[PDB]
Ligand binder design. Structure first.
Ligand SMILES: [Zn+2]
Lengths: 59, 207, 176, 145, 38
RNA sequence: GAUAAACGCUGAAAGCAUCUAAGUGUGAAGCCCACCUCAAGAUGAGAUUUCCCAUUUCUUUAAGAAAGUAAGACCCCUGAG
RNA sequence: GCACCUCGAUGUCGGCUCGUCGCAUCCUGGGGCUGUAGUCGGUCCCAAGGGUUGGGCUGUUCGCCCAUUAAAGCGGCACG
RNA sequence: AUGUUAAGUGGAAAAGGAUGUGGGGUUGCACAGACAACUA
């Protein structure tokens, strides 16, 4: 799961560690299992989430 | 450069002008024919394909006749390639005869050595025997196979096996005489191979 | 640099073309070119040049000194040219000149032959003197150290080929 | 034993790429090429399947070596005959036979089993600016790493 | 040439240099003094 | 051909001197070729010349099965270089 | 020196046959210094491609001797 | 973010040797002219 998430996030301008920090600073609690499942099936949902993380650590 | 294919007839003797006796080897070479010309644009290098020794026609097949047809000859028994010869100067159909060489003409000579079969380390490699008396049980054997530490035998440990039958060339021999109406060259010394076996003669590489 | 700061002022005939790196001094004999570096730059107001240095480099001065020395040499030579003179001690030795063929006779069981490239010449007046003449400072020096290399000088009688000012030390070989 | 995707043999498309090797140090270029051949940049990555892309490396003659590697880094080989080490090579490979160079660097950064050996047959390396593979329509990759 | 791990100027005219990573002494008055550290 | 010890040429840092940092050479029975032999199972399996060119039912039409053949090869017999 | 290892078994030295590797180089190749005139040498540096002998006496290595040679190297490999 | 190392040091070893480079100090001699180089 972690390697698939890294692969997907680097396509949205992030890396794995910065995106995990961003999701924690926003209070999102998705598994790494559902995150990878989204990364392969629903790219638009994965981008919604990556934008929320990018705005969280923009402070 | 210069080079021809022939067959081995045998050895004889001859006296010179001054009156010295000299051992010799007769080689017979009826005219060789150029069958193909290889170039860089087509093949990637430069060479010449030569044939020797006409063959009866029940003994060849249709692909061979097609290959020999563009040169207007009978099917051949021996086909070799001759390299490092300024192409030009050559074309399919030409005949190379023994007057390509003249007396003098230090030359190289190649053949395939006689066959001898399964032979031991003493005849095959020049290894020495063990003692024949004095309580000995070690006459005609190949030696110790190595030391203990590597737990195996190294490569090029030499042993028994099939001897002879390899190709060998001998360098810097002399042409003693050339006879044109008979297609014969006389070479000073001995050559490798048996009688009726294929022989190749080229001008020498070390000049 | 004290060398890097000094002045090069070009006598008559000099033209100095610029193209990126290359410089090409020309004069009344030759038209030498040499590749120089970026971090030291050209100059204006003909019949004078200085070079300059953006500081803060570690060594702070080396590249500067060489980049000026070489240009001063090119000018000094393209207007004037350089000279190297070789002597000959060692009784029985002689040189002779035939175009670009320098023939030498030094104790050997064969004469020795040297040939000079484009920019260079030879000048043998006598069986003792040789003179190497060119524009380059490097090539003339290399060719003279080539010639003197055929037979350096011994110390017990000082025979052999020497630069025309070499100070050789002399030993006392006993008489047996 | 539940739902995580796993890819199949001929299901995930493989694209062709062109990478340019003038002034990139040997190992940095080689690390990036090695990750692209294994498919690590695609979320469909599964380890018992091959999903990497193909890579063309161009201008291998101008690859960079820092320090004194061009004279002091040496490649050894043994012929398995007694006393038969061959230490013949140095940064002479970069002059003559610069494909050997790139290939032996990339080969040591891939797994050592039958999948990693089959992923090595997608590298095509060229000493000059031109490749013979224009019918596969390859896209340019740009390195900054 | 002397090759020793102690390389020392031993008259007036001796100089020390570094032609590679290698210390050397070089004297124009006495060729016995020439030295290279090793 | 590129090098080891050694020896330079030009040259500054360090107005001089200095084989070295930038540039430029010489130099060993050693190293890579040069000579001889093996080598495409080099699964990265390479190249050139020549020779040969279509019946039957269908699972379904598919890199389908089965049958008789071309060029060529082999079994079997006389042997030896 | 020690006693980890092997006591339901790990057979000692010289010679023979067959070698291979290190370099702290015995010869041959290239060099700097000399209290190096030449012919021979001393010593230090680079160099492992190839070469490195037959007898007498002792079970003998080791050793001494005889006649030669460009030279008659020193170690590891279960003191192969 | 700010520096150091050029030795593949990092990624085995000492007495001793050295104009390798970074930082901090103590001073002799310097425009009533220094060190070096060239005349006499
Ligand atoms: Zn001195």
């Amino acid at each position: 799961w972690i390697a698939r998430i890294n692969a997907a996030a680097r396509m949205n301008g992030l890396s794995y560690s910065k995106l995990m920090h961003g999701l924690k600073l926003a209070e999102i609690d998705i598994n790494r299992k559902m995150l990878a499942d989204l990364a392969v099936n629903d790219a638009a949902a994965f981008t919604a989430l990556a934008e929320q993380a990018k705005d969280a650590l923009s402070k | 450069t210069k080079g021809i294919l022939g067959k081995k007839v045998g050895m004889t003797q001859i006296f010179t002008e001054s009156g010295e006796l000299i051992p010799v080897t007769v080689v017979e070479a009826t005219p060789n024919v150029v069958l193909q010309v290889k170039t860089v644009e087509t093949d990637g290098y430069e060479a010449i394909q030569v044939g020797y020794q006409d063959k009866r026609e029940v003994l060849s097949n249709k692909p061979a006749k097609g290959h020999v047809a563009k040169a207007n000859t009978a099917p051949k028994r021996f086909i070799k390639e001759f390299k490092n010869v300024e192409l030009g100067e050559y074309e399919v159909g030409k005949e190379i005869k023994v007057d390509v060489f003249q007396a003098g003409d230090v030359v190289d000579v190649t053949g395939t050595t006689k066959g001898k079969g399964f032979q031991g380390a003493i005849k095959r490699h020049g290894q020495s025997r063990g003692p024949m008396s004095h309580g000995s049980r070690y006459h005609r054997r190949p030696g110790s196979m190595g030391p203990v530490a590597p737990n195996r035998v190294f490569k090029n440990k030499r042993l028994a096996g099939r001897m002879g039958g390899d190709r060998v060339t001998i360098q810097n021999l002399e042409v003693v005489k050339v006879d044109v109406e008979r297609n014969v060259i006389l070479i000073k010394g001995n050559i490798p191979g048996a009688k009726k076996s294929l022989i190749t003669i080229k001008s020498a590489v070390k000049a | 640099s004290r060398i890097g700061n000094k002045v090069v002022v070009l006598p008559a005939g000099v033209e100095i073309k610029q193209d990126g790196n290359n410089i090409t001094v020309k004069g009344p004999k030759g038209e030498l070119t040499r590749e120089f570096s970026s971090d030291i730059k050209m100059n204006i107001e003909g019949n004078e040049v200085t070079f300059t240095r953006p500081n803060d480099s570690k060594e702070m001065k080396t590249i500067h000194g060489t980049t000026r020395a070489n240009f001063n040499n090119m000018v000094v030579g393209v207007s004037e040219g350089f000279q190297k003179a070789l002597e000959l001690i060692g009784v029985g030795y002689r040189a002779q000149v035939q175009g670009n063929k320098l023939t030498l006779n030094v104790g050997y069981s064969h004469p020795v032959e040297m040939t000079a490239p484009e920019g260079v010449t030879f000048e043998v007046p006598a069986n003792t003197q040789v003179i190497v003449k060119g524009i380059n400072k490097e090539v003339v020096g290399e060719l003279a150290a080539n010639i003197r290399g055929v037979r350096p000088p011994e110390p017990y009688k000082g025979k052999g080929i020497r630069y025309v000012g070499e100070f050789v030390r002399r030993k006392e070989g006993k008489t047996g | 034993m539940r739902t995580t995707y796993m890819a199949k043999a001929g299901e995930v498309e493989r694209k062709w790429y062109v990478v340019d090797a003038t002034d990139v140090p040997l190992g940095r270029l080689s690390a990036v090429v090695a990750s692209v051949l294994r498919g690590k940049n695609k979320p469909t990555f599964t380890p018992h399947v091959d999903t990497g892309d193909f890579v063309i490396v161009i201008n291998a003659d101008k690859v960079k070596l820092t320090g004194k590697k061009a004279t002091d880094k040496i490649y050894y080989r043994h012929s398995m005959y007694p006393g038969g080490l061959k230490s013949v090579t140095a940064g002479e490979l970069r002059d003559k036979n610069s494909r050997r160079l790139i290939e032996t660097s990339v080969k040591g950064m891939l797994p050592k089993n039958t999948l990693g050996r089959k992923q090595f047959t997608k590298l095509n390396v060229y000493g000059g600016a031109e490749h013979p593979h224009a019918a596969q329509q390859p896209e340019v990759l740009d390195i900054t790493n | 040439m002397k090759v020793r791990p102690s390389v020392k100027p031993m008259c007036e005219h001796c100089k020390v240099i570094r032609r590679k990573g290698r210390v050397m002494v070089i004297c124009p008055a006495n060729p016995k003094h020439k030295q290279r550290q090793g």
